[PDB]
Subunit: 484 residues, 3 copies
C-alpha cells in the first residue's frame, strides 16, 4: 500500500501576537505597526522649514532690530527655539495666541509701505531699550508719534482698500509711567486711540503707572491688530498715545503653521515632522509625539502592535500530517504533500493554496483604515502658563481623541489577527477535503491527517493525485478487494 499526508511549514523562531479569543499565540511571522523612534533631525525637504534662531514670530513681524534678517520671509513650518529673546522696548499683546496663530497660518511676512500723513506731530521716536547700533531705535514696522513744539493736535487720517485682497494693520498704544511723563510726551493729560472700519471698532485708553524695569524702561506698549476687507476703509483717530503703523501685511490662506522645537535641521527628505524630529510614515500608527505636521501616522498610546502575517506555529514531534504537527523541513511553500511509497519517500508543495493564502494576507489593513491623514495647522497641545477654562477644554478634546484612536487601533489589530488565523486554518482544511474528495473509495484516513492508498500508487499516481486528474475507476476493483 501507500501513505499520503498533508501538512504545513513551521519555523524555529516564532512571534507571539494576540487575537480575540487568544491572549497569546505563536505565529510564523509578524510585522510591527507602531513607529516608536526618530532620528532626532528635522528634514528640509519637501517642506520649506524656516529656523527661527533667537527670534519669535511676533518679534520678527514687529521688526526687532536683531530680527531684521526675517524681512519679507516665507515658510511652510516656522520653528521656534526655546533660547529666543526680545531686545527692544517692553511690550505685551492682548490676545497673543490668536495673533500668533493668524500670522503662522498666513504663511508670509510681505510688507507694503503706505503714505500716512501726520500733521503737527514729530515722528520716528526711539528708546535706549531698542538700539540700532550706537543710536536709539524702535520697531521698524511702527511709528512712535510725539508732540511737536508744544502742541499735539487731534489726528484724523483715512486709508481705503482699493485692492482685491485683505490687509492686516498692526498698531499700538503707549502706557506712560507717570503723569509728568505723559504730559512731557503728549501734551494732553489723558490720551485716547480709536481705530475702526465700517464693520468693527476698537477704542483704547492708556493706563499710567510704575512697572518693573525692563531694559531701563518702566512703561509698556500694547499691540493691537485690524483686518480691512477689499472695498473697505480704515480710519485712525487719536489725541495721544499712538504707535502708528507704517503699512499693511498681505494675509493669505494656506497650509503653513508654527512649531516649537529644539531639534537641529539637516539635509534629508521626510514628509512628517515632529518636535522630536522627522519620522517615516510607512506605518499606520506612531508613538513619538502627538504634535505633527505633514503626512503623519496617528498617535496611539501603545508602544507596540504586532500584526500576524503567517499561520500558527506548531513544533514537530512513519510520517504524520498536519494534526498537532509541523513540518520544519518544508521551504518550497506553505502547504504540501508527503508520500511514503514502495519506491521511497518524497515531498512536494501545493501552489494554489499558498498563493490564495498569501493574496489574502497581502494588502491587509488597507481595506479598513486609510493610507495617511494630512493635517497642517491645529490647536496647541502644550502649555507653559496656567490659563483656566480654555486650556482645560483643549486638554479634554485632545485626551478624548487620543483615547478613542488607541481603542480603535487595539480592536482592529485583534480582529485582523483573528481573521488571518481563521483563513490559514480554513485553507489547510479545504486542501485536505479536496484531496479526500479526489479519492472516492480507494483511500482511508488514519486520523493523523494522512491518507492510506490500498492500491499500488506509483510516482505517476501521486503526481496525478496532486494535479487533479486521478481516476478512481482504474484502481477501484483492486482497492475494494484490498480493503475487504
Amino acid at each position: 500500500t501507500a501513505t499520503l499526508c498533508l501538512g504545513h511549514h513551521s519555523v524555529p523562531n516564532g512571534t507571539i501576537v494576540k487575537t480575540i479569543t487568544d491572549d497569546q499565540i505563536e505565529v510564523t511571522n509578524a510585522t510591527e505597526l507602531v513607529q516608536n523612534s526618530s532620528t532626532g533631525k528635522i528634514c528640509n525637504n519637501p517642506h520649506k522649514v524656516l529656523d527661527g534662531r533667537d527670534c519669535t514670530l511676533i518679534d520678527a513681524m514687529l521688526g526687532d532690530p536683531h530680527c531684521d534678517v526675517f524681512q519679507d520671509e516665507k515658510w511652510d513650518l516656522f520653528v521656534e527655539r526655546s533660547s529666543a529673546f526680545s531686545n527692544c522696548y517692553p511690550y505685551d499683546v492682548p490676545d497673543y495666541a490668536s495673533l500668533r496663530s493668524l500670522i503662522a497660518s498666513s504663511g508670509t511676512l510681505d510688507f507694503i509701505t503706505e503714505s500716512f500723513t501726520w500733521a503737527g506731530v514729530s515722528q520716528n521716536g526711539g528708546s535706549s531699550a531698542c538700539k540700532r547700533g550706537p543710536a536709539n531705535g524702535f520697531f521698524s514696522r511702527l511709528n512712535w508719534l510725539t508732540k511737536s513744539g508744544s502742541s499735539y493736535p487731534l489726528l484724523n487720517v483715512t486709508m481705503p482698500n482699493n485692492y482685491n485682497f485683505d490687509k492686516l494693520y498692526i498698531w499700538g498704544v503707549h502706557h506712560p509711567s507717570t503723569n509728568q511723563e505723559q504730559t512731557n510726551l503728549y501734551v494732553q493729560a489723558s490720551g485716547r486711540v480709536t481705530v475702526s472700519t465700517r464693520r468693527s471698532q476698537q477704542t483704547i485708553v492708556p493706563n499710567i503707572g510704575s512697572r518693573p524695569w525692563v531694559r531701563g524702561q518702566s512703561g509698556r506698549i500694547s499691540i493691537y491688530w485690524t483686518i480691512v476687507k477689499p472695498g473697505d476703509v480704515l480710519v485712525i483717530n487719536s489725541n495721544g498715545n499712538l504707535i502708528a503703523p507704517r503699512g499693511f501685511f498681505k494675509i493669505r490662506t494656506g497650509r503653513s503653521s508654527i512649531m516649537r522645537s529644539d531639534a537641529p535641521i539637516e539635509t534629508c527628505i521626510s514628509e512628517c515632522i515632529t518636535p522630536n524630529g522627522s519620522i517615516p510614515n510607512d506605518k499606520p500608527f506612531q508613538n513619538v509625539n502627538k504634535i505633527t505636521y505633514g503626512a503623519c501616522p496617528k498617535y496611539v498610546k501603545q508602544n507596540t502592535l504586532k500584526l500576524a502575517t503567517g499561520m500558527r506555529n506548531v513544533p514537530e514531534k512513519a510520517i504524520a500530517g498536519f494534526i498537532e504537527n509541523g513540518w520544519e523541513g518544508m521551504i518550497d511553500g506553505w502547504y504540501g504533500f508527503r508520500h511514503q511509497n514502495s519506491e521511497g519517500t518524497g515531498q512536494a508543495a501545493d501552489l494554489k493554496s499558498t498563493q490564495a493564502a498569501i493574496d489574502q494576507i497581502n494588502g491587509k489593513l488597507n481595506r479598513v483604515i486609510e493610507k495617511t491623514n494630512e493635517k497642517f495647522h491645529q490647536i496647541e497641545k502644550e502649555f507653559s502658563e496656567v490659563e483656566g477654562r480654555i486650556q482645560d477644554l483643549e486638554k479634554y478634546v485632545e485626551d478624548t481623541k487620543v483615547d478613542l484612536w488607541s481603542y480603535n487601533a487595539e480592536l482592529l489589530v485583534a480582529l485582523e489577527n483573528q481573521h488571518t488565523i481563521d483563513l490559514t486554518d480554513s485553507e489547510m482544511n479545504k486542501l485536505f477535503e479536496k484531496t479526500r474528495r479526489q479519492l472516492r473509495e480507494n483511500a482511508e484516513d488514519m486520523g493523523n491527517g494522512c491518507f492510506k492508498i490500498y492500491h499500488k500508487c506509483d510516482n505517476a499516481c501521486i503526481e496525478s493525485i496532486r494535479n487533479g486528474t486521478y481516476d478512481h475507476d482504474i484502481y477501484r476493483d483492486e482497492a475494494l478487494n484490498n480493503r475487504f
Copy 2:
C-alpha cells in the same frame, strides 16, 4: 441508478462589494448606504420654518424699520438669507455670536412693554439714517434719551421681577463723533452707563472719535443684554449716552435653532433639513452637509458604501462546487436530479428562509435608527478670529474622521459575515442531505450524489421532505455498489 445535485441561484448582473479578507467580491444583490443628493428645496413640514428675507435675527429683534413684519414671531428653524442688509443707525454688538445663539435657541420674539419713567430727559429720539416712512425714526425696542432744555440729570430707576420666568433686557451705549456732539446731546462731557442686578454688573464708558460714514453717521451704538432671574431686581444708573430699553423679552428653553441657507421653501414633508435642502433619512449615513437640523443621518466623507444582501455570484447536471444555477428563481437553494424518467428541479424553503431571516434587519442590531440634534456649534465662518475658531474646526474634524472610520469598518464586517453565513448555510444543507443517505449514496466530488438504487420521483420527494428510508434499499444498493 440516479444523480442528485445541490446548487444555488445566480443572476446575469451582480454588484461588487468589499469585505475584510477580500478586496473586491461579487454578490447577487446590494444596497447603498450613503445619501449623497438633495432636491434643492426646504420642506415646511413638520417643522416650523420661518424665512427671513432681508432681515437677520438681531435686526428683527432690535426693531429695524424694514423688519417690522417679524414682530412677535415663533419658529423651529430660522433661515437667514445672504441678501439681508441693515437699514438703521450703525451699531456693533460685542460677542455677537453669543447673543445670536441664545436668541435663536429661545425660539420666540415675544416682547412685553414695561412702564419705565425717565425724569428730566426727552424720549423717543430719531436719526436721518433710520427713516420710518418720510419721518426720522429709530429701533422700535430701544429708547434714545437726550437732554431736555439745558440739563441731563442722573437717571436711577429700578424694575423688580415678580414673575416666575427669566427676563431678557436689551440696552445700548452711544459713542459720539466729537466732543461738541457729546456736549450738545448730553450736558455732561463724559457719560456712563451702569446696569446691574443683585449678582452681576456692567459699566460702560462711551468713547468719542470719528468713524467711516454709514448712511450719514460717524457715530456708533454698542448693544448689551442682561437676564433677570425671578425674584431678582434690575437697576439702571446712567449719567449720559444711554439707549434705554422699552421692556423685556420672554426667554425660554427649547429645541429651536437658526440656519444660513439660500435654498427656496416649498410644500413637502421631511424630518431632515440641510442648507442644500431637505434630504430623506432612510439611510444610516449621508454626504450632503455636516450642518443639519432634525432627525438626520450621520455625516461621512465616503461618497458610497455598498452593503451586501445576497450570496456570492458564481457563473455557471452539476452541483454547487464553483457552479451557479441561472434557472432557479423560486428560491436560493434546491436540488437537481437526473433520473430515468427525466430531469427535475425543486427549491428548498428552510435554508432560504434562514438566510433571509439572518440577512433582513442587519445594521439595526448595532447602530441606532436616527439621532435628533437641534442646536449645535457653528461650523462655517466668514472672518478669521483665532483660538476659538481653531478649536471648533479641530473638534468637527475629529468627529467626522472618527465616524467615517466607524462606518467603513462596520460595512466591511457585515459584508464578511453575510458571505460567511450564506456559505455555511449551503454547506449545512449539503451535509444534511449526505447524512440522510446513509450508505445508498456516494459523493461524486462536484457537489452531487450518485444513488445506487432505484430512486423514482417519489423517492426524490421522500429525500427532499426528510422521510427517506435507507433500510428499504440498503441491500439493493450494497449489491449494486460492490
Copy 3:
C-alpha cells in the same frame, strides 16, 4: 451492537443576548456589563474628601468669617453643597470659573503672610455687611485701605519672588455707589489700580453708580489674581480704590478637583465618586453620571448590556442535533452509551476546559481595565452664556455617542464569537470521536454512532481515552455490516 451519542448540557432557565446575526438568542449563562445603581453615599477612603458645608471654595479662599474653619486645608476632592451662601461684603469675580478651577486643581489653601508697607493710609477697614461678632469686619485675606487724615497718597510698593515656586496674589478694586462716597473714602475723585509683573500688567478704573442692596450695601468689589514666577517681581501702584493683599498662596500641581453633590459622606472604601455617590468599578461601563472622580468605568447611554458566558440553550438516547441534555451536570461535553449491560453517561475534560479557558478572561483582550481621570471640564451649567457653553456641551455629547457605539459593537462581536467557538468545539469533539472509529461504526444522523461490534465498558472507555484499536474488531464489524 452498541450506540454512542454525543451531546451538550442545557439549563432549565437561560438568558437572552444579541449577536451580529441574531436579534434574540438564548444562552445558558450571561453577565451584566453596565453599572446603573449606587448607595447614595460618598466614601472617604482612599481619597481625601473635604466637606464644604455652607462654604464655597472662593468664599473659603477669600476668608469669609463664617468660612474661617477652612483655613490652610488640603483635599483630593472638594464637595460643594447646594445650600452654600455668602455673609460678607457683596462682590463679583470677573472670569469666576477659571479662578475656581485653578484653586480646585491646586489642591491646597496654604497661605503665607508677607510684610507689605502702605505709607500714608489707614488699614484694616470693615463694613456692617461682614460681621465678626459685635464688631465689623472684612475678608481675612484682604486689606481695605482708605484715606488717613485728609490725604490719600500714591501707593507704590514692590515685593520680589526669591523662592523656587510660584506665588498667587489675590487683590480687589472697590466700586463706590456715589461720587460723595468716593470722595469721602478716597481724596481723589477718580482712583486707579495697576498691578504688574515683568511680563504682564492689569489696570482697573473703578466704576461709580447705584446697585441693588445686598446686606445693606450698594457698592461692589471685583476680585483679580496675579501669578508671580520664581525670579520675577510684583509692583502695586495705586492712588485709590485698592483692596490690598496680605500675602500669597502656594499653587501646586496635582490631581485634586471639585464636585457639586448633596450625598452624605460615610466611612467606606471606594475608588469611584459620582454626584449620586460612590459606585463599584468592577464593570467596564456605567450609566449613573457622566461626572466622575477617580478610577471609574466609562459612561454609556445604555442601561443594560448582556455578555454571553455559556452556550446556546436547546430544549431536550440521542445526540446534540437539535437536542440538549438536561441531566448533564458533570461538565459541558460528554458521551452517552447504550450497551447490552445498560445505559451510561460520561463527561469530557479537554473540550470543557478549552471552552472555559477561551471564555474566561474575555473582553479583557480589547478594552483596558480601568482609566484614571481626575480633573475635567464642567458638564452642568446654571446660567446661559453662549459660545463656550455650547462648545463644551457639543464636545461631551460627541464623546458620549462615540463610546456608547463602541460598547454596543464590542458586546455584539464578543457574543457572536463565543457562540461560534462553543459550536466549533462540539463539532471538533464529534469529528475526533468519528475519527477514532474508522470502519467499525456508522453515523446514524442525529449525532450518534452505531457500533457494529460488541463494545463493552472497557471498549467504551478505550474510545473515550483515545486508545481504541479498530483492527481487533475490524473483521467482526465488517461481517456484521455486510
